[PDB]
Tab-separated table of C-alpha atoms in Angstrom:
chain	number	residue	atom	x	y	z
A	1	UNK	CA	-24.745	57.236	-79.348
A	2	UNK	CA	-22.232	58.336	-76.729
A	3	UNK	CA	-22.028	60.672	-73.761
A	4	UNK	CA	-19.156	62.414	-71.981
A	5	UNK	CA	-19.365	64.351	-68.706
A	6	UNK	CA	-16.817	65.890	-66.391
A	7	UNK	CA	-16.796	64.692	-62.807
A	8	UNK	CA	-15.490	67.025	-60.096
A	9	UNK	CA	-14.279	66.389	-56.518
A	10	UNK	CA	-16.659	67.807	-53.906
A	11	UNK	CA	-13.840	69.017	-51.648
A	12	UNK	CA	-10.065	69.253	-51.296
A	13	UNK	CA	-9.779	65.623	-50.134
A	14	UNK	CA	-11.630	64.015	-53.065
A	15	UNK	CA	-14.213	62.686	-50.594
A	16	UNK	CA	-16.598	62.092	-53.506
A	17	UNK	CA	-17.146	63.255	-57.077
A	18	UNK	CA	-20.164	64.996	-58.627
A	19	UNK	CA	-21.299	64.922	-62.236
A	20	UNK	CA	-23.984	67.191	-63.705
A	21	UNK	CA	-27.140	65.394	-64.884
A	22	UNK	CA	-30.056	66.912	-66.808
A	23	UNK	CA	-33.489	65.718	-65.633
A	24	UNK	CA	-36.843	66.644	-67.115
A	25	UNK	CA	-38.210	69.149	-69.596
A	26	UNK	CA	-37.066	71.893	-69.467
A	27	UNK	CA	-33.859	70.434	-68.047
A	28	UNK	CA	-33.238	70.597	-64.313
A	29	UNK	CA	-29.510	70.090	-63.729
A	30	UNK	CA	-28.546	68.256	-60.544
A	31	UNK	CA	-25.049	67.231	-59.459
A	32	UNK	CA	-25.118	63.505	-58.777
A	33	UNK	CA	-22.661	61.055	-57.240
A	34	UNK	CA	-22.091	58.361	-59.861
A	35	UNK	CA	-21.906	55.118	-57.888
A	36	UNK	CA	-20.794	51.835	-59.455
A	37	UNK	CA	-21.631	50.170	-56.117
A	38	UNK	CA	-25.399	50.781	-56.217
A	39	UNK	CA	-28.233	50.773	-58.721
A	40	UNK	CA	-30.715	53.523	-57.824
A	41	UNK	CA	-30.881	56.967	-59.429
A	42	UNK	CA	-32.336	59.091	-56.639
A	43	UNK	CA	-32.547	62.820	-56.103
A	44	UNK	CA	-33.311	65.486	-53.573
A	45	UNK	CA	-36.688	66.818	-54.634
A	46	UNK	CA	-39.642	69.078	-53.944
A	47	UNK	CA	-40.986	66.060	-51.990
A	48	UNK	CA	-38.020	65.852	-49.609
A	49	UNK	CA	-38.844	66.650	-45.970
A	50	UNK	CA	-37.964	70.346	-45.753
A	51	UNK	CA	-35.812	70.069	-42.606
A	52	UNK	CA	-33.672	67.470	-44.413
A	53	UNK	CA	-32.754	69.808	-47.282
A	54	UNK	CA	-29.800	72.128	-46.618
A	55	UNK	CA	-28.382	73.705	-49.766
A	56	UNK	CA	-28.946	70.910	-52.295
A	57	UNK	CA	-30.500	71.528	-55.682
A	58	UNK	CA	-33.879	69.780	-55.923
A	59	UNK	CA	-35.788	68.097	-58.730
A	60	UNK	CA	-39.364	69.364	-59.009
A	61	UNK	CA	-41.324	66.864	-61.104
A	62	UNK	CA	-44.382	69.144	-61.346
A	63	UNK	CA	-42.256	71.561	-63.416
A	64	UNK	CA	-41.231	68.855	-65.895
A	65	UNK	CA	-43.611	68.273	-68.788
A	66	UNK	CA	-42.138	64.803	-69.354
A	67	UNK	CA	-42.351	63.595	-65.724
A	68	UNK	CA	-44.857	60.845	-64.930
A	69	UNK	CA	-45.547	59.365	-61.505
A	70	UNK	CA	-44.765	55.657	-61.553
A	71	UNK	CA	-47.924	54.589	-59.801
A	72	UNK	CA	-47.510	52.604	-56.601
A	73	UNK	CA	-43.721	52.522	-56.795
A	74	UNK	CA	-41.559	53.204	-53.753
A	75	UNK	CA	-37.869	52.812	-52.960
A	76	UNK	CA	-35.674	52.613	-49.891
A	77	UNK	CA	-31.920	52.140	-49.749
A	78	UNK	CA	-29.233	51.799	-47.097
A	79	UNK	CA	-25.558	52.200	-47.939
A	80	UNK	CA	-22.408	50.658	-46.478
A	81	UNK	CA	-21.548	53.854	-44.615
A	82	UNK	CA	-24.822	53.708	-42.680
A	83	UNK	CA	-26.614	56.403	-44.680
A	84	UNK	CA	-30.056	55.914	-46.235
A	85	UNK	CA	-32.859	57.484	-48.225
A	86	UNK	CA	-36.352	56.586	-49.476
A	87	UNK	CA	-39.317	57.902	-51.439
A	88	UNK	CA	-41.479	57.494	-54.539
A	89	UNK	CA	-40.700	57.275	-58.248
A	90	UNK	CA	-41.183	59.208	-61.460
A	91	UNK	CA	-40.129	58.382	-64.981
A	92	UNK	CA	-38.566	61.272	-66.900
A	93	UNK	CA	-35.947	62.161	-69.489
A	94	UNK	CA	-32.399	61.981	-68.160
A	95	UNK	CA	-29.277	63.125	-70.006
A	96	UNK	CA	-25.608	62.729	-69.087
A	97	UNK	CA	-22.986	64.488	-71.149
A	98	UNK	CA	-25.180	64.525	-74.252
A	99	UNK	CA	-26.519	60.959	-73.901
A	100	UNK	CA	-30.289	60.881	-73.389
A	101	UNK	CA	-32.537	58.187	-71.896
A	102	UNK	CA	-36.298	58.627	-72.025
A	103	UNK	CA	-38.456	56.903	-69.422
A	104	UNK	CA	-35.666	56.656	-66.825
A	105	UNK	CA	-36.791	55.882	-63.282
A	106	UNK	CA	-35.981	58.960	-61.187
A	107	UNK	CA	-36.390	58.090	-57.534
A	108	UNK	CA	-37.604	61.140	-55.631
A	109	UNK	CA	-36.526	61.326	-51.989
A	110	UNK	CA	-39.137	61.939	-49.324
A	111	UNK	CA	-36.582	61.186	-46.587
A	112	UNK	CA	-32.792	61.287	-46.448
A	113	UNK	CA	-30.457	60.532	-43.550
A	114	UNK	CA	-28.362	63.159	-41.821
A	115	UNK	CA	-25.139	62.614	-43.782
A	116	UNK	CA	-26.948	63.421	-47.030
A	117	UNK	CA	-28.551	66.542	-45.549
A	118	UNK	CA	-25.183	67.655	-44.197
A	119	UNK	CA	-23.493	67.444	-47.604
A	120	UNK	CA	-24.782	70.377	-49.633
A	121	UNK	CA	-22.722	69.423	-52.705
A	122	UNK	CA	-24.449	66.108	-53.553
A	123	UNK	CA	-27.960	66.363	-55.014
A	124	UNK	CA	-28.437	62.572	-55.267
A	125	UNK	CA	-26.881	59.377	-56.612
A	126	UNK	CA	-26.770	57.777	-60.039
A	127	UNK	CA	-26.259	54.041	-59.650
A	128	UNK	CA	-24.120	52.142	-62.125
A	129	UNK	CA	-24.015	48.651	-60.573
A	130	UNK	CA	-26.262	45.915	-61.972
A	131	UNK	CA	-30.010	46.515	-62.088
A	132	UNK	CA	-30.619	43.431	-59.925
A	133	UNK	CA	-29.715	45.662	-56.930
A	134	UNK	CA	-32.296	48.354	-57.746
A	135	UNK	CA	-34.597	48.863	-54.751
A	136	UNK	CA	-37.802	50.031	-56.467
A	137	UNK	CA	-40.851	48.034	-55.382
A	138	UNK	CA	-43.036	46.354	-56.535
A	139	UNK	CA	-41.464	46.623	-60.010
A	140	UNK	CA	-37.668	46.825	-60.054
A	141	UNK	CA	-36.257	49.503	-62.356
A	142	UNK	CA	-33.230	49.679	-64.651
A	143	UNK	CA	-30.131	51.824	-64.221
A	144	UNK	CA	-29.317	54.654	-66.593
A	145	UNK	CA	-26.580	52.532	-68.174
A	146	UNK	CA	-28.862	49.523	-68.570
A	147	UNK	CA	-31.461	51.728	-70.319
A	148	UNK	CA	-28.853	53.398	-72.559
A	149	UNK	CA	-26.842	50.305	-73.405
A	150	UNK	CA	-28.538	49.144	-76.583
A	151	UNK	CA	-28.235	52.636	-78.100
A	152	UNK	CA	-24.553	53.087	-77.283
A	153	UNK	CA	-21.851	52.669	-79.926
A	154	UNK	CA	-20.264	50.086	-77.594
A	155	UNK	CA	-21.908	48.749	-74.403
A	156	UNK	CA	-19.398	50.304	-72.010
A	157	UNK	CA	-18.792	53.201	-69.704
A	158	UNK	CA	-15.471	54.446	-68.360
A	159	UNK	CA	-14.410	56.134	-65.126
A	160	UNK	CA	-11.403	58.449	-65.194
A	161	UNK	CA	-11.335	60.052	-61.750
A	162	UNK	CA	-8.838	62.802	-60.975
A	163	UNK	CA	-6.553	63.245	-57.998
A	164	UNK	CA	-7.408	66.660	-56.574
A	165	UNK	CA	-8.708	67.528	-60.069
A	166	UNK	CA	-11.682	66.929	-62.355
A	167	UNK	CA	-12.009	63.783	-64.443
A	168	UNK	CA	-14.438	62.172	-66.858
A	169	UNK	CA	-17.241	59.631	-67.185
A	170	UNK	CA	-17.722	58.442	-70.777
A	171	UNK	CA	-20.569	56.305	-72.093
A	172	UNK	CA	-20.402	54.214	-75.239
A	173	UNK	CA	-16.747	54.630	-76.229
A	174	UNK	CA	-13.196	54.218	-74.975
A	175	UNK	CA	-11.075	57.374	-75.276
A	176	UNK	CA	-7.741	55.925	-76.359
A	177	UNK	CA	-6.006	59.241	-75.552
A	178	UNK	CA	-7.003	59.041	-71.872
A	179	UNK	CA	-4.592	56.308	-70.743
A	180	UNK	CA	-1.060	55.035	-71.262
A	181	UNK	CA	-0.044	51.556	-72.372
A	182	UNK	CA	-2.777	48.947	-72.777
A	183	UNK	CA	-6.028	48.167	-70.990
A	184	UNK	CA	-5.913	44.849	-69.100
A	185	UNK	CA	-9.301	43.182	-68.846
A	186	UNK	CA	-10.289	40.895	-65.996
A	187	UNK	CA	-13.296	38.698	-65.201
A	188	UNK	CA	-16.373	39.970	-63.353
A	189	UNK	CA	-18.875	38.124	-61.194
A	190	UNK	CA	-22.312	39.732	-61.189
A	191	UNK	CA	-23.664	37.299	-58.569
A	192	UNK	CA	-23.850	39.960	-55.831
A	193	UNK	CA	-24.944	42.702	-58.274
A	194	UNK	CA	-21.559	44.450	-58.172
A	195	UNK	CA	-18.623	44.918	-60.532
A	196	UNK	CA	-16.830	42.212	-58.574
A	197	UNK	CA	-13.391	41.040	-59.683
A	198	UNK	CA	-10.202	39.461	-58.323
A	199	UNK	CA	-6.966	41.391	-58.010
A	200	UNK	CA	-3.819	39.305	-58.437
A	201	UNK	CA	-1.904	40.857	-55.531
A	202	UNK	CA	-0.149	43.897	-54.141
A	203	UNK	CA	3.084	45.682	-53.288
A	204	UNK	CA	3.910	48.368	-50.735
A	205	UNK	CA	6.217	51.131	-51.943
A	206	UNK	CA	9.252	49.707	-53.709
A	207	UNK	CA	8.712	46.322	-52.056
A	208	UNK	CA	8.296	43.000	-53.803
A	209	UNK	CA	4.943	42.086	-55.298
A	210	UNK	CA	2.908	39.558	-53.302
A	211	UNK	CA	0.861	37.274	-55.545
A	212	UNK	CA	-2.445	36.650	-53.826
A	213	UNK	CA	-6.083	36.705	-54.942
A	214	UNK	CA	-8.114	39.585	-53.547
A	215	UNK	CA	-11.799	39.520	-54.460
A	216	UNK	CA	-13.427	42.930	-54.323
A	217	UNK	CA	-15.686	45.449	-56.014
A	218	UNK	CA	-14.929	48.437	-58.223
A	219	UNK	CA	-16.942	51.122	-56.399
A	220	UNK	CA	-16.798	54.754	-57.465
A	221	UNK	CA	-19.203	55.650	-54.651
A	222	UNK	CA	-16.805	54.611	-51.879
A	223	UNK	CA	-14.005	57.062	-51.053
A	224	UNK	CA	-11.320	54.754	-49.702
A	225	UNK	CA	-9.577	51.472	-50.475
A	226	UNK	CA	-10.758	48.680	-48.140
A	227	UNK	CA	-8.623	45.527	-48.140
A	228	UNK	CA	-7.930	42.513	-45.893
A	229	UNK	CA	-6.392	43.311	-42.514
A	230	UNK	CA	-3.176	41.489	-43.401
A	231	UNK	CA	-2.632	43.700	-46.476
A	232	UNK	CA	-3.523	46.897	-44.645
A	233	UNK	CA	-1.200	46.082	-41.730
A	234	UNK	CA	1.663	45.455	-44.176
A	235	UNK	CA	1.056	48.879	-45.742
A	236	UNK	CA	0.874	50.924	-42.522
A	237	UNK	CA	3.849	49.111	-40.997
A	238	UNK	CA	5.933	51.082	-43.521
A	239	UNK	CA	4.794	54.424	-42.055
A	240	UNK	CA	6.530	55.470	-38.824
A	241	UNK	CA	4.011	56.183	-36.105
A	242	UNK	CA	0.979	54.817	-37.979
A	243	UNK	CA	-1.527	52.910	-35.876
A	244	UNK	CA	-5.061	51.609	-35.945
A	245	UNK	CA	-7.248	53.758	-33.720
A	246	UNK	CA	-10.547	52.293	-32.528
A	247	UNK	CA	-11.618	55.756	-31.328
A	248	UNK	CA	-11.063	57.378	-34.728
A	249	UNK	CA	-12.272	54.324	-36.653
A	250	UNK	CA	-9.243	53.186	-38.606
A	251	UNK	CA	-5.588	53.688	-39.345
A	252	UNK	CA	-4.152	57.122	-38.652
A	253	UNK	CA	-0.655	58.390	-39.263
A	254	UNK	CA	1.478	61.442	-38.447
A	255	UNK	CA	0.611	64.254	-40.831
A	256	UNK	CA	4.382	64.862	-41.144
A	257	UNK	CA	4.846	61.484	-42.885
A	258	UNK	CA	5.676	60.875	-46.522
A	259	UNK	CA	3.451	57.912	-47.500
A	260	UNK	CA	4.654	55.011	-49.666
A	261	UNK	CA	2.809	54.044	-52.823
A	262	UNK	CA	0.543	51.011	-53.019
A	263	UNK	CA	0.408	48.752	-56.080
A	264	UNK	CA	-2.434	46.385	-56.968
A	265	UNK	CA	-2.456	43.703	-59.642
A	266	UNK	CA	-4.842	43.351	-62.558
A	267	UNK	CA	-3.869	40.110	-64.215
A	268	UNK	CA	-0.179	40.507	-65.020
A	269	UNK	CA	-0.548	44.317	-65.048
A	270	UNK	CA	0.093	46.660	-62.135
A	271	UNK	CA	-1.657	49.874	-61.053
A	272	UNK	CA	0.365	52.170	-58.786
A	273	UNK	CA	-1.437	54.389	-56.276
A	274	UNK	CA	0.949	57.223	-55.337
A	275	UNK	CA	1.428	57.770	-51.613
A	276	UNK	CA	-0.177	61.207	-51.689
A	277	UNK	CA	-3.476	59.610	-52.844
A	278	UNK	CA	-3.588	57.793	-49.478
A	279	UNK	CA	-3.561	60.998	-47.361
A	280	UNK	CA	-7.027	62.064	-46.153
A	281	UNK	CA	-5.794	64.843	-43.937
A	282	UNK	CA	-6.244	65.742	-40.279
A	283	UNK	CA	-8.710	63.640	-38.309
A	284	UNK	CA	-10.182	66.873	-36.931
A	285	UNK	CA	-9.384	70.466	-37.783
A	286	UNK	CA	-5.874	71.408	-36.647
A	287	UNK	CA	-4.848	67.893	-35.629
A	288	UNK	CA	-1.435	66.499	-36.554
A	289	UNK	CA	-2.929	63.009	-36.815
A	290	UNK	CA	-4.041	62.241	-40.371
A	291	UNK	CA	-6.570	59.691	-41.637
A	292	UNK	CA	-5.388	56.911	-43.925
A	293	UNK	CA	-6.835	56.146	-47.336
A	294	UNK	CA	-6.220	52.398	-47.096
A	295	UNK	CA	-8.352	50.766	-44.388
A	296	UNK	CA	-9.328	47.274	-43.308
A	297	UNK	CA	-12.367	45.621	-44.856
A	298	UNK	CA	-12.659	43.272	-41.879
A	299	UNK	CA	-16.280	43.327	-40.780
A	300	UNK	CA	-17.484	44.927	-44.041
A	301	UNK	CA	-17.708	41.481	-45.573
A	302	UNK	CA	-16.238	42.563	-48.902
A	303	UNK	CA	-13.102	44.291	-50.197
A	304	UNK	CA	-13.752	47.618	-51.885
A	305	UNK	CA	-11.646	49.208	-54.614
A	306	UNK	CA	-12.981	52.695	-53.991
A	307	UNK	CA	-11.869	56.048	-55.332
A	308	UNK	CA	-8.367	55.864	-53.830
A	309	UNK	CA	-7.676	52.885	-56.103
A	310	UNK	CA	-9.825	53.773	-59.102
A	311	UNK	CA	-8.458	57.300	-59.496
A	312	UNK	CA	-4.995	55.820	-60.164
A	313	UNK	CA	-6.421	54.137	-63.289
A	314	UNK	CA	-8.520	54.490	-66.397
A	315	UNK	CA	-11.321	51.997	-65.708
A	316	UNK	CA	-13.570	50.320	-68.275
A	317	UNK	CA	-16.916	48.966	-67.112
A	318	UNK	CA	-17.693	46.597	-69.974
A	319	UNK	CA	-21.391	45.754	-70.056
A	320	UNK	CA	-21.221	43.219	-72.871
A	321	UNK	CA	-23.266	40.017	-72.529
A	322	UNK	CA	-20.510	38.701	-70.262
A	323	UNK	CA	-19.359	41.793	-68.368
A	324	UNK	CA	-15.679	42.454	-67.678
A	325	UNK	CA	-13.564	45.225	-66.154
A	326	UNK	CA	-10.562	46.902	-67.740
A	327	UNK	CA	-7.768	48.852	-66.059
A	328	UNK	CA	-5.039	50.993	-67.599
A	329	UNK	CA	-2.436	53.279	-66.116
A	330	UNK	CA	-2.741	56.947	-67.040
């Protein structure tokens, strides 16, 4: 089997991407944030504290003839950005782009933190990291990909995120028309539960490539590119007037600037992030100070190849017995 679904930016900055997911019988379609940095499929629901729902579409398990309470199971998750959610668990039928999993754990939120409430466009998350990170207790549950894998034509999924435009998540096949050149594959460590890999270096604009190992994670659920302070300083030094602002919480730059590109290495291959991908717009409405899309990972504890990086590539998440990651230009 295979599946193919369009993923759409939630706003004009590409702050996140939503993908429609069918849950239950009859189908209830929710727009979920596909997150290769976590491993829970959770949704706003009829069980969510009413004051914490503000415009989201909810899953109502009582209206699904295939929903079953997973007795005794609870979940609770906290994300890198400080947000969180928790609740109980159903199993139900879940379909993405024509690919169906029966008996998928659907984690129903009883509580969500303010940032989730405040974002009316995201109805929940669909985790695509390794199932070892799944938070369901006392019996850990599998991700949608893990459940689908054996049925897929090939045990892979691909992320093709757009810049200021829709893109695609495919399951079970590689669309050879969706990228240019070849796909370069690189080793993955699953020891921390992430799609963790090592970039071979970077360049800023038309500058020379610096060969240096940068361990980090491929994370579709993180907006920005978080890299070591040395790398980030070298980038922003090429932008007149750019500075790190403790009050804003990262590097800012004059909105009048033209930003240089940023290149990262995948083996001997190179992925180029155009400068415009690095512009996240005014820090507050009407400001002429703009927020940068490349930020320091210092104090995160890990480098993160988030959407800013991934959207410059066609990315293969290869879930073979020994997982690997592939990157192509597009």
